[PDB]
Curated annotation (Swiss-Prot):
InterPro entries: RetroV_VpR/X (IPR000012). The keyword 4Fe-4S does not apply. Phosphorylated on several residues by host. These phosphorylations regulate VPR activity for the nuclear import of the HIV-1 pre-integration complex. Homooligomer, may form homodimer. Interacts with p6-gag region of the Pr55 Gag precursor protein through a (Leu-X-X)4 motif near the C-terminus of the P6gag protein. Interacts with host UNG. May interact with host RAD23A/HHR23A. Interacts with host VPRBP/DCAF1, leading to hijack the CUL4A-RBX1-DDB1-DCAF1/VPRBP complex, mediating ubiquitination of host proteins such as TERT and ZGPAT and arrest of the cell cycle in G2 phase. Residues 1-42 are annotated as: Homooligomerization. This is Protein Vpr. It comes from Human immunodeficiency virus type 1 group M subtype B (strain 89.6) (HIV-1). Belongs to the HIV-1 VPR protein family.
Length: 96
C-alpha cells in the first residue's frame, strides 16, 4: 500500500509508470518487428490450422489431443497412487 490513488511519483508500486514503460517497450519491439512480421503469425497459423480442411483441422485436433493426453496423465497420476484408497479405483464391493 501507499498514500496515493494508484501512482504519484515518489510513491510508486511495481506497476504504475512501469506499465507505460512496459507498453513503450512492447511498441519499440513491435515497430522494429514490423518490416519482418511473418514467422510470428506463420508459425501460429500452421500450428493451429495449416490446410484448415482435414489437414489443419487435424492439426487443431492434435492440439486438443495433446491437451487431453495431459489431463489423462494427471488423472492417472491421481489414481495409481491409491488403487485401493478404500477401494478408490477398484469400485467392486464399494465400501472400503
Amino acid at each position: 500500500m501507499e498514500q496515493a490513488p494508484e501512482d504519484q511519483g515518489p510513491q510508486r508500486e511495481p506497476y504504475n509508470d512501469w506499465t507505460l514503460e512496459l507498453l513503450e517497450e512492447l511498441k519499440n519491439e513491435a515497430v522494429r518487428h514490423f518490416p519482418r512480421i511473418w514467422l510470428h503469425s506463420l508459425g501460429q497459423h500452421i500450428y493451429e490450422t495449416y490446410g484448415d480442411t482435414w489437414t489443419g483441422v487435424e492439426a487443431l485436433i492434435r492440439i486438443l489431443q495433446q491437451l487431453l493426453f495431459i489431463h489423462f496423465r494427471i488423472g492417472c497420476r491421481h489414481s495409481r497412487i491409491g488403487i485401493i484408497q478404500q477401494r478408490r479405483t477398484r469400485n467392486g464391493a464399494s465400501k472400503s
